[PDB]
Design an enzyme around this catalytic site. Structure first.
Site, PDB file in Angstrom:
ATOM      1  N   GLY A  35      22.134  21.919   0.282  1.00 51.80           N
ATOM      2  CA  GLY A  35      23.452  21.559  -0.203  1.00 51.80           C
ATOM      3  C   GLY A  35      24.484  21.201   0.855  1.00 51.80           C
ATOM      4  N   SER A  36      24.048  20.656   1.994  1.00 55.39           N
ATOM      5  CA  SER A  36      25.022  20.192   2.984  1.00 55.39           C
ATOM      6  C   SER A  36      25.808  18.990   2.429  1.00 55.39           C
ATOM      7  CB  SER A  36      24.349  19.837   4.317  1.00 55.39           C
ATOM      8  OG  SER A  36      23.551  18.674   4.198  1.00 55.39           O
ATOM      9  N   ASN A  37      25.149  18.118   1.670  1.00 55.13           N
ATOM     10  CA  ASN A  37      25.873  17.007   1.050  1.00 55.13           C
ATOM     11  C   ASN A  37      26.864  17.503  -0.004  1.00 55.13           C
ATOM     12  OD1 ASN A  37      25.201  14.035   1.798  1.00 55.13           O
ATOM     13  ND2 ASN A  37      23.219  15.073   1.896  1.00 55.13           N
ATOM     14  N   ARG A  68       9.691  15.226 -19.072  1.00 52.10           N
ATOM     15  CA  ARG A  68      10.852  14.780 -18.317  1.00 52.10           C
ATOM     16  C   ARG A  68      12.086  14.615 -19.213  1.00 52.10           C
ATOM     17  NH1 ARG A  68      10.327  13.178 -12.935  1.00 52.10           N
ATOM     18  NH2 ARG A  68       8.064  13.160 -13.279  1.00 52.10           N
ATOM     19  N   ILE A  88      12.811  12.780 -10.375  1.00 51.66           N
ATOM     20  CA  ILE A  88      12.983  11.450 -10.939  1.00 51.66           C
ATOM     21  C   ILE A  88      13.498  11.553 -12.372  1.00 51.66           C
ATOM     22  CG2 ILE A  88      11.798   9.396 -11.714  1.00 51.66           C
ATOM     23  CD1 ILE A  88       9.875   9.832  -9.314  1.00 51.66           C
ATOM     24  N   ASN A 136      23.420   8.345  -6.024  1.00 55.22           N
ATOM     25  CA  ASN A 136      22.408   9.059  -5.257  1.00 55.22           C
ATOM     26  C   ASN A 136      22.586   8.786  -3.774  1.00 55.22           C
ATOM     27  OD1 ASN A 136      19.850  10.593  -4.900  1.00 55.22           O
ATOM     28  ND2 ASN A 136      18.998   8.598  -4.309  1.00 55.22           N
ATOM     29  N   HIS A 195      20.436   8.621  -0.219  1.00 51.41           N
ATOM     30  CA  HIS A 195      19.059   8.448   0.230  1.00 51.41           C
ATOM     31  C   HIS A 195      19.052   8.239   1.740  1.00 51.41           C
ATOM     32  CE1 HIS A 195      14.785   7.398  -0.092  1.00 51.41           C
ATOM     33  NE2 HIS A 195      15.044   6.467   0.807  1.00 51.41           N
ATOM     34  N   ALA A 228      19.505   3.462 -10.839  1.00 51.24           N
ATOM     35  CA  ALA A 228      18.875   2.655 -11.871  1.00 51.24           C
ATOM     36  C   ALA A 228      17.527   3.289 -12.198  1.00 51.24           C
ATOM     37  CB  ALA A 228      18.707   1.212 -11.415  1.00 51.24           C
ATOM     38  N   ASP A 247      14.325   2.145 -11.870  1.00 53.48           N
ATOM     39  CA  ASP A 247      13.457   2.071 -10.700  1.00 53.48           C
ATOM     40  C   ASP A 247      14.058   2.866  -9.542  1.00 53.48           C
ATOM     41  OD1 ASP A 247      11.537   0.586 -11.957  1.00 53.48           O
ATOM     42  OD2 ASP A 247      12.181  -1.341 -11.122  1.00 53.48           O
TER      43      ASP A 247
HETATM   44  N1  LIG Z   1      15.277   7.080 -12.291  1.00 49.25           N
HETATM   45  C1  LIG Z   1      15.695   7.470 -11.010  1.00 49.25           C
HETATM   46  N2  LIG Z   1      16.175   6.522 -10.180  1.00 49.25           N
HETATM   47  C2  LIG Z   1      16.589   6.821  -8.938  1.00 49.25           C
HETATM   48  O1  LIG Z   1      17.079   5.771  -8.086  1.00 49.25           O
HETATM   49  C3  LIG Z   1      16.524   8.179  -8.509  1.00 49.25           C
HETATM   50  C4  LIG Z   1      16.843   8.910  -7.322  1.00 49.25           C
HETATM   51  C5  LIG Z   1      16.504  10.258  -7.613  1.00 49.25           C
HETATM   52  C6  LIG Z   1      16.657  11.467  -6.647  1.00 49.25           C
HETATM   53  C7  LIG Z   1      15.287  11.894  -6.013  1.00 49.25           C
HETATM   54  C8  LIG Z   1      14.291  10.737  -5.965  1.00 49.25           C
HETATM   55  C9  LIG Z   1      12.875  11.181  -5.695  1.00 49.25           C
HETATM   56  C10 LIG Z   1      11.880  10.339  -5.140  1.00 49.25           C
HETATM   57  C11 LIG Z   1      10.605  10.992  -4.983  1.00 49.25           C
HETATM   58  C12 LIG Z   1      10.562  12.352  -5.400  1.00 49.25           C
HETATM   59  C13 LIG Z   1       9.229  13.167  -5.261  1.00 49.25           C
HETATM   60  O2  LIG Z   1       8.256  12.538  -4.796  1.00 49.25           O
HETATM   61  N3  LIG Z   1       8.921  14.553  -5.558  1.00 49.25           N
HETATM   62  C14 LIG Z   1       9.744  15.593  -6.102  1.00 49.25           C
HETATM   63  C15 LIG Z   1       9.099  16.032  -7.367  1.00 49.25           C
HETATM   64  C16 LIG Z   1       9.927  15.734  -8.608  1.00 49.25           C
HETATM   65  C17 LIG Z   1       9.782  14.303  -9.190  1.00 49.25           C
HETATM   66  O3  LIG Z   1       9.306  13.334  -8.448  1.00 49.25           O
HETATM   67  O4  LIG Z   1      10.138  14.070 -10.407  1.00 49.25           O
HETATM   68  C18 LIG Z   1       9.752  16.799  -5.144  1.00 49.25           C
HETATM   69  O5  LIG Z   1      10.521  16.818  -4.086  1.00 49.25           O
HETATM   70  O6  LIG Z   1       8.987  17.799  -5.395  1.00 49.25           O
HETATM   71  S1  LIG Z   1      12.145  12.688  -5.967  1.00 49.25           S
HETATM   72  N4  LIG Z   1      16.029  10.342  -8.856  1.00 49.25           N
HETATM   73  C19 LIG Z   1      16.013   9.141  -9.423  1.00 49.25           C
HETATM   74  N5  LIG Z   1      15.621   8.743 -10.649  1.00 49.25           N
HETATM   75  N1  LIG Z   2      15.077  11.264  -2.321  1.00 43.93           N
HETATM   76  C1  LIG Z   2      16.393  11.809  -2.021  1.00 43.93           C
HETATM   77  C2  LIG Z   2      16.436  12.483  -0.661  1.00 43.93           C
HETATM   78  O1  LIG Z   2      15.486  12.411   0.123  1.00 43.93           O
HETATM   79  N2  LIG Z   2      17.562  13.148  -0.390  1.00 43.93           N
HETATM   80  C3  LIG Z   2      17.809  13.740   0.907  1.00 43.93           C
HETATM   81  O2  LIG Z   2      17.598  15.155   0.904  1.00 43.93           O
HETATM   82  C4  LIG Z   2      18.495  15.798   1.830  1.00 43.93           C
HETATM   83  C5  LIG Z   2      19.233  16.925   1.109  1.00 43.93           C
HETATM   84  O3  LIG Z   2      19.975  17.743   2.023  1.00 43.93           O
HETATM   85  P1  LIG Z   2      21.172  18.723   1.512  1.00 43.93           P
HETATM   86  O4  LIG Z   2      20.545  19.637   0.474  1.00 43.93           O
HETATM   87  O5  LIG Z   2      21.620  19.461   2.756  1.00 43.93           O
HETATM   88  O6  LIG Z   2      22.189  17.760   0.926  1.00 43.93           O
HETATM   89  C6  LIG Z   2      19.439  14.709   2.337  1.00 43.93           C
HETATM   90  O7  LIG Z   2      19.007  14.215   3.620  1.00 43.93           O
HETATM   91  C7  LIG Z   2      19.264  13.605   1.306  1.00 43.93           C
HETATM   92  O8  LIG Z   2      19.559  12.292   1.799  1.00 43.93           O
END
Ligand SMILES: Nc1nc(=O)c2cc(CCCc3ccc(C(=O)N[C@@H](CCC(=O)O)C(=O)O)s3)[nH]c2[nH]1
Ligand SMILES: NCC(=O)N[C@@H]1O[C@H](COP(=O)([O-])[O-])[C@@H](O)[C@H]1O
Length: 200
Positions: free
Chosen positions: A11-13, A64, A91, A106, A108, A140, A142
């Site tokens: 939770g630094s963000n 989901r 996701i 979001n 990233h 979005a 995707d």
């Molecule tokens: N519809 C949608 N569009 C986005 O632009 C977006 C960004 C996030 C935010 C996060 C995007 C993530 C990418 C890959 C993840 C992963 O590989 N593993 C997760 C498991 C949970 C899951 O994939 O459902 C993990 O860390 O265990 S989590 N969630 C989104 N959902």
């Molecule tokens: N797919 C999204 C992703 O990779 N998010 C990344 O997780 C970290 C969370 O740190 P935080 O808990 O200190 O904010 C941050 O680096 C953020 O960009």
């Protein structure tokens, strides 16, 4: 604008957003913090700041869509205008994303469209870029493909690891996430009718 912040960990963000939204000129207020994982440090940060928290364990739902509905319910409870995903690692489903279209952001840790996914830093190091960075975008359907709001470039140093690179990139994240939230909450930036980014 009333904001929900969703987290999965440190939770630094979130902390950077809490600090920015309490500046007198902030157009955003954080009214609820939601985590999908219990006992994470982001929850401590929220409670310490006097912000309500809710844990919604994705493991307790059949799919989901049900999980997202549980999130949505809380979003409605607190009359939320804007959703920030801040280290939230799930996701989201199509209908949920569609409902919050133009209202959900979001962060990233890459310069999108490079290195989409959950291990952006590993990818960047493996690829050998000398410049990486971070991206705030509208969510979005995707993943990591929605409209870009702000980005900031961050150098990769020789010998960097995920530890040292993510530390450097987090310093930039904590700058552009609050800036992006303020842009959307003030109505300065919106998702245009044609889906592209609109600066009023
Ligand atoms: N519809 C949608 N569009 C986005 O632009 C977006 C960004 C996030 C935010 C996060 C995007 C993530 C990418 C890959 C993840 C992963 O590989 N593993 C997760 C498991 C949970 C899951 O994939 O459902 C993990 O860390 O265990 S989590 N969630 C989104 N959902
Ligand atoms: N797919 C999204 C992703 O990779 N998010 C990344 O997780 C970290 C969370 O740190 P935080 O808990 O200190 O904010 C941050 O680096 C953020 O960009």
């Amino acid at each position: 604008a009333r904001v929900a912040v969703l987290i999965s960990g440190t939770g630094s963000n979130l902390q950077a957003l809490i600090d920015s939204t309490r500046e007198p000129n902030s157009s955003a207020q954080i009214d609820i913090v939601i985590s999908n994982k219990a006992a994470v440090a982001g929850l401590d940060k929220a409670e310490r700041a006097g912000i309500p928290t809710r844990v919604i364990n994705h493991k307790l739902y059949k799919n989901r869509v049900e999980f997202d509905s549980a999130i949505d319910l809380v979003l409605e409870e607190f009359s939320i205008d804007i959703v920030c995903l801040a280290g939230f690692m799930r996701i989201l489903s199509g209908p949920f994303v569609q409902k919050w279209n133009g209202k959900m952001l979001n962060i990233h840790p890459s310069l999108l469209p490079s290195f989409k996914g959950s291990n952006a830093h590993e990818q960047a190091l493996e690829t050998g870029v000398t410049v990486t960075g971070c991206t705030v975008h509208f969510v979005a359907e995707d993943v990591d493909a929605g409209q870009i709001i702000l980005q900031e470039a961050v150098p990769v140093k020789r010998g960097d690891t995920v530890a040292t690179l993510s530390e450097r990139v987090k310093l930039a994240e904590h700058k552009i996430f609050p800036a992006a939230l303020q842009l959307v909450a003030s109505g300065t930036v919106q998702l245009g009718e044609n889906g592209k980014i609109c600066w009023v």
